[PDB]
Amino acid sequence: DRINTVRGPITISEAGFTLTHEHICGSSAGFLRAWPEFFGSRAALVEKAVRGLRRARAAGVRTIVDVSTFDIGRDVSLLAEVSRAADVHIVAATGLWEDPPLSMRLRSVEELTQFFLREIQYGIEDTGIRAGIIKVATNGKATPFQELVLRAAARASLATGVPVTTHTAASQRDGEQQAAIFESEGLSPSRVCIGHSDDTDDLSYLTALAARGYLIGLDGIPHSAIGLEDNASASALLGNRSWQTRALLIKALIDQGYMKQILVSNDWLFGFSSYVTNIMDVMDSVNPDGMAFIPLRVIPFLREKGVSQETLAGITVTNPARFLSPTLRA
Amino acid sequence: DRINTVRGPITISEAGFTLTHEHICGSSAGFLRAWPEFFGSRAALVEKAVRGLRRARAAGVRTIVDVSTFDIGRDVSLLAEVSRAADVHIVAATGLWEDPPLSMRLRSVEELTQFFLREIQYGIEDTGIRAGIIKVATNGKATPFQELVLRAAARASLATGVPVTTHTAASQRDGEQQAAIFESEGLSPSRVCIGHSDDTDDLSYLTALAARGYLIGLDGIPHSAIGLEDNASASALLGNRSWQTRALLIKALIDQGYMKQILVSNDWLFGFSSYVTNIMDVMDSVNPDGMAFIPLRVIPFLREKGVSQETLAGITVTNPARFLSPTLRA
Ligand SMILES: *[C@]1(*)CC[C@@](C)(CC)CC1
Ligand SMILES: *[C@]1(*)CC[C@@](C)(CC)CC1
Ligand SMILES: CCO[P@@](C)(=O)OC
Ligand SMILES: CCO[P@@](C)(=O)OC
Ligand SMILES: [Zn+2]
Numbered sequence: 276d277r278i279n280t281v282r283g284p285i286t287i288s289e290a291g292f293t294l295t296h297e298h299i300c301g302s303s304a305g306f307l308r309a310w311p312e313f314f315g316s317r318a319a320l321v322e323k324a325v326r327g328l329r330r331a332r333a334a335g336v337r338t339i340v341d342v343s344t345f346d347i348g349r350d351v352s353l354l355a356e357v358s359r360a361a362d363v364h365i366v367a368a369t370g371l372w373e374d375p376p377l378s379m380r381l382r383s384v385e386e387l388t389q390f391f392l393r394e395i396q397y398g399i400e401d402t403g404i405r406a407g408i409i410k411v412a413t414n415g416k417a418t419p420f421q422e423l424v425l426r427a428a429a430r431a432s433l434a435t436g437v438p439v440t441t442h443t444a445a446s447q448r449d450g451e452q453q454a455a456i457f458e459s460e461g462l463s464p465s466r467v468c469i470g471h472s473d474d475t476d477d478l479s480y481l482t483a484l485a486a487r488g489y490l491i492g493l494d495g496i497p498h499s500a501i502g503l504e505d506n507a508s509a510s511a512l513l514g515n516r517s518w519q520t521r522a523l524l525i526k527a528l529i530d531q532g533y534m535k536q537i538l539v540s541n542d543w544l545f546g547f548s549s550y551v552t553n554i555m556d557v558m559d560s561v562n563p564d565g566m567a568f569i570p571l572r573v574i575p576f577l578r579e580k581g582v583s584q585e586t587l588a589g590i591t592v593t594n595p596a597r598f599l600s601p602t603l604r605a
Numbered sequence: 606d607r608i609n610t611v612r613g614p615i616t617i618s619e620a621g622f623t624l625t626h627e628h629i630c631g632s633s634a635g636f637l638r639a640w641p642e643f644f645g646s647r648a649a650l651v652e653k654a655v656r657g658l659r660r661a662r663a664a665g666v667r668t669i670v671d672v673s674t675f676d677i678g679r680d681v682s683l684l685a686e687v688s689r690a691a692d693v694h695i696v697a698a699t700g701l702w703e704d705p706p707l708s709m710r711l712r713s714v715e716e717l718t719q720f721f722l723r724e725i726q727y728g729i730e731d732t733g734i735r736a737g738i739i740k741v742a743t744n745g746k747a748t749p750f751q752e753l754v755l756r757a758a759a760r761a762s763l764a765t766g767v768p769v770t771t772h773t774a775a776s777q778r779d780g781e782q783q784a785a786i787f788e789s790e791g792l793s794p795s796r797v798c799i800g801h802s803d804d805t806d807d808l809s810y811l812t813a814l815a816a817r818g819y820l821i822g823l824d825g826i827p828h829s830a831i832g833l834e835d836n837a838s839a840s841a842l843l844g845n846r847s848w849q850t851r852a853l854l855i856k857a858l859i860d861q862g863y864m865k866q867i868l869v870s871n872d873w874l875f876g877f878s879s880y881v882t883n884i885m886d887v888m889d890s891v892n893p894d895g896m897a898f899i900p901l902r903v904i905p906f907l908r909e910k911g912v913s914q915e916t917l918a919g920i921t922v923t924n925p926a927r928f929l930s931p932t933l934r935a
C-alpha cells in the first residue's frame with residue numbers, strides 16, 4: 276500500500292494524476308557530474324525542470340514516473356531537488372536502457388538481478404532513495420545481453436512486486452519478444468507496461484499484447500516532427516505522425532475494451548544530452564507545454580472526440596496507481 | 606615546470622620513478638558509485654589499492670599515471686584517497702577510451718575539446734583535480750567518433766602542453782592512423798605515447814613510430830595467459846606471449862637508438878569490472894607483484910640481459926618526466 280518516491284513512500288491516493296513515462300534529464304551515467312556546462316549549468320537545468328513541473332502541476336499532474344535508468348544518467352539527488360521545489364512526486368527507476376556500459380554488459384542474469392534489487396530494496400547509490408519501477412529496452416530483436424536484462428527485471432519484479440516498463444521499437448513488434456521472455460520467467464503481464472507503443476498504428480500488435488494482460492504505454496503523444504521536414508535528426512527521433520494520430524490510439528484501445536490497461540505520457544525531458552546538440556530546443560519549439568501537454572491538450576482532445584471524463588480519470592489516475600502499487604498480480 | 610596530480614601540482618624532480626600506464630580501477634562511469642558491492646565494497650577496493658601502491662613504493666615507484674578516463678569510470682576522489690594513504694603520486698587522465706556513452710559519442714570535435722580542456726584547465730567534476738594526461742583509444746581502424754576524439758585530444762594538448770597517451774590494437778598497426786590524425790592537427794609526436802605497443806613483435810611498425818618521434822608505450826609487460834590455456838577469456842585479454850618476450854622489446858628499442866622514447870608500465874589495476882567476473886583474481890594469480898612487477902622483475906631481467914642501470918633509470922625516471930612536463934615540444 277505504498278509507492279517509493281525520491282522523497283520517500285507515498286500512499287496510493289497521494290499519487291493522483293500520474294504521468295508514467297517521463298524524464299528530468301536524458302543523459303548518460305556520470306555525464307551531468309562531469310560536464311554540467313553542456314546543459315548551461317546544473318542550476319539552469321534544475322530551474323528549467325522546476326518551472327516545467329510547476330506548469331504541469333498547475334494543469335493537474337501530481338506524480339511523474341522518471342524512467343531514467345543508470346545508463347540514462349539518472350541522478351536521484353537532482354530528481355529529489357526538483358520534486359521538493361515543484362511539489363510533484365517523482366518515482367525513480369532501476370533497470371537498463373539501450374546504452375549500458377561494459378561493466379553492465381558483461382554481467383550475468385544473477386548479477387543484474389542483484390543490482391536491480393539493490394536499487395529497489397536498499398537504495399540508489401548512497402542516497403537511500405529506492406526505485407519504484409524497473410525500466411528495460413530493446414530496439415528490434417533483443418541482443419543477448421538485453422535478454423538477460425529482461426530476465427533480471429522479471430526476477431527483480433517477482434521478488435518485490437515493483438512493475439516493469441519497457442522501451443520498444445514498436446514498428447518491429449518488440450513487445451512480442453519482450454512478453455515471451457518475461458513470461459518464460461513467470462512474470463504476470465499485469466506487472467508490465469510495453470512502452471513507446473504509440474509509435475505504431477498496428478492494432479493487431481497492440482491488441483495481441485493487451486489481450487494477454489499487458490499494460491500499453493502510449494507515452495510519446497507530443498513527439499512529432501510534422502512541420503520540420505528539413506531537420507533529419509528531429510524527423511528520425513520524433514517521426515512524422517501527428518500528435519493527434521498518436522492520441523487517437525488511446526481512443527482506439529478504449530473502444531476495444533482496454534481502458535484499464537492504457538498508460539499515457541509525454542516522454543518529455545528538461546535536458547537531453549544523449550542525442551544531437553540543441554535537440555531540447557527543437558523539442559521545446561514543437562511542444563511548448565512540455566509535460567503539461569497531456570492534461571492541456573490531449574485530455575480535451577479526447578473529450579471532444581467522445582471519450583468521457585470518467586474514463587480519462589481512470590486512465591490518468593486509477594491505472595497508474597494500480598500499476599505502481601507493489602504486488603505480484605494487478 | 607609542474608605536473609598536476611590528484612593532490613595538486615608537483616615538481617618534475619618529485620615525480621621520480623614513474624609508471625606511465627596504470628589503473629586504480631578499470632570500470633565504467635558511475636559504476637563504482639552505483640554498485641560498490643561488485644568490488645566487495647568501496648573500502649575493500651581502497652584497501653587493496655593502498656596495499657598495492659605501498660608494495661610498489663617499497664620497490665622504488667614514486668608516481669603512477671592512472672590513465673583511466675570518464676568512460677573507464679575514473680573516480681578522482683578515490684585516486685586522491687589512495688594517493689594520500691600510500692604516499693605515491695597519481696596523475697589523473699582526461700580523454701575517452703573505447704566505451705564512450707551516447708552523450709559523448711554524439712559530440713563534435715569542438716565540444717569534445719571543451720570537455721578535455723575542462724578537465725585539464727578547471728577540474729574533474731567538482732573536485733578541482735586537474736588531469737595531467739589525455740587518454741584516447743582505437744581498436745583497429747578508427748570509428749568516425751574516435752577520429753573526433755583523437756583530433757580533440759590533439760587540440761587540447763596544443764592549448765595546454767599536456768601529453769596524449771593511446772590505447773591501440775597494436776597487431777593492427779593502429780598507431781599509424783593515430784599518428785596521421787594527430788599530425789593533421791599539428792601535434793608534435795614528442796607529446797604522444799602510442800600505448801599497448803608491447804602487444805606486437807612487429808619492429809617495422811614500432812620503429813616507424815619511434816623514427817617520427819613518438820614515445821612507445823611498452824605498458825603491459827606482465828600481461829600473459831601462459832599457463833592458463835584452459836581460460837579463454839584470460840587468453841583473449843592477456844595473450845599468449847610471455848612477459849619476457851614483452852620485456853625484450855624494451856631492449857630491442859634501446860638497441861635501435863630509442864632509449865629516450867621508451868615508456869614502461871604494467872597496465873595493472875586493483876578492480877576490474879569492465880571485463881569478466883573474477884578477472885582480477887585471475888590477473889593477481891598471474892602477477893602477484895602487481896604494479897611492483899616492473900621494478901622487481903623487469904628491471905633485474907633487463908640488467909641480466911646487459912642493459913645498464915643508467916639506461917634503465919633514464920627510462921623509468923627521465924623519460925616520464927620529459928613526457929609529463931607540460932610543453933608544446935619535448
Ligand atoms: C468514458 C466512459 C466510457 C466510454 C464512453 C466508453 C464506452 C469512454 C469514456
Ligand atoms: C644503459 C647504457 C647504454 C646501453 C649499454 C646501450 C649501449 C644500454 C644500457
Ligand atoms: C532519454 C531518451 O529516452 P527515450 C528512449 O524515451 O527517447 C526520447
Ligand atoms: C581498464 C582496462 O583498460 P586497458 C585497455 O589498458 O586493458 C586492461
Ligand atoms: Zn525509450
Ligand SMILES: [Zn+2]
Nearest residue numbers: 296298342542
Ligand atoms: Zn523515455
Ligand SMILES: [Zn+2]
Nearest residue numbers: 771772773801
Ligand atoms: Zn588500453
Ligand SMILES: [Zn+2]
Nearest residue numbers: 626628672872
Ligand atoms: Zn590501461
